[PDB]
Amino acid sequence: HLLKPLPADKQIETGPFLEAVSHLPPFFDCLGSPVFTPIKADISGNITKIKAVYDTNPAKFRTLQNILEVEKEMYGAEWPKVGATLALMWLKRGLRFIQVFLQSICDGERDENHPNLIRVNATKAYEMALKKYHGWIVQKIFQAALYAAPYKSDFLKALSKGQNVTEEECLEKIRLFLVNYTATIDVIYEMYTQMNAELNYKV
Ligand SMILES: CCCCCCCC/C=C\CCCCCCCC(=O)N[C@@H](CO[C@@H]1O[C@H](CO)[C@@H](O)[C@H](O)[C@H]1O)[C@H](O)/C=C/CCCCCCCCCCCCC
Ligand code: NI
């Protein structure tokens, strides 16, 4: 299934969002390299934390905007470096990395001298989504992941394990997934900017 479409007023229901993005971390089990373990843990850990907050009062935390706004009231000067707000601040970055990476691949972006690597696509996604927030030690993790990254064809076979679809059919399904996914992430970014909740610290 696809993510829910964005409503006209751009308020994103928490429950459906968490349920949908909860399907993303299992993909990492298809990628054998040791770095995918802490990557999966990071993404899943943030999902878990936002879910834990949501579950304390689903009515009050019905939308992601509710989460930020209510946490701001709950935590005073500790906000936004607190709670589900912090978890979602980092989740959105992981989700944008995925967005940019997959979009790049689907649009045929490549290094003409290495057309079956995915380095250029991962580098674009990293620069757009994560690099500004990573100190050198974490950047080394990215660099090592790049070196060991699967070939494009292998990667796409993993995305479509279970489906028996062609590479081109796999890309078409990703393009459709990307529609509501991209729109939703863009709203989450806007929300953090509007609330002055984007933090710029490096890890
Ligand atoms: C259709 C479905 C498609 C699925 C396909 C998925 C393919 C995706 C591949 C990789 C996704 C990578 C996402 C990584 C997100 C990392 C977020 C991050 O920077 N989290 C930080 C901060 O952590 C935060 O610290 C905070 C406190 O300061 C805490 O409060 C937070 O809870 C905590 O999250 C953490 O320090 C870093 C974790 C790992 C960084 C990995 C760097 C890049 C990975 C290499 C990618 C190459 C891909 C090649 C293709 C296979
Ligand atoms: Ni689902």
UniProtKB/Swiss-Prot annotation:
A GO-annotated cellular component: cytosol
Sequence repeats: 39-49, 50-60
Chief localisation class: cytoplasm
Consequence when changing L159R: 46% decrease in activity
Gene3D superfamilies named in the record: Glycolipid transfer protein (1.10.3520.10)
InterPro entries assigned to the protein according to its UniProt record, in alphabetical order: GLTP_sf, Glycolipid_transfer_prot_dom
Effect on the protein upon substituting I39N: 18% decrease in activity
Cellular location(s): Cytoplasm
Gene Ontology biological process: ceramide transport; intermembrane lipid transfer; response to immobilization stress
Keywords on record: Acetylation, Cytoplasm, Lipid transport, Repeat, Transport
Single GO term (MF): lipid transfer activity
Binding site for beta-D-galactosyl-(1->4)-beta-D-glucosyl-(1<->1)-N-[(9Z)-octadecenoyl]-sphing-4-enine: D42, I43, S44, G45, N46, I47, T48, K49, H134, Y201
Signal peptide positions on this chain: none
Outcome following mutation: F142S: About 50% decrease in activity
Consequence recorded when altering Y201L: No loss of activity; 90-97% residual activity
Outcome recorded upon mutating L130R: Significant inactivation; 5% residual acti vity
Tissue: Detected in fibroblasts (at protein level). Detected in fibroblasts and in various cancer cell lines.
Consequence when changing N46I: Significant inactivation; 15% residual activity
Role, per record: Accelerates the intermembrane transfer of various glycolipids. Catalyzes the transfer of various glycosphingolipids between membranes but does not catalyze the transfer of phospholipids. May be involved in the intracellular translocation of glucosylceramides.
Family per record: Belongs to the GLTP family.
The name this protein goes by in its record: Glycolipid transfer protein
Organism: Homo sapiens (Human)
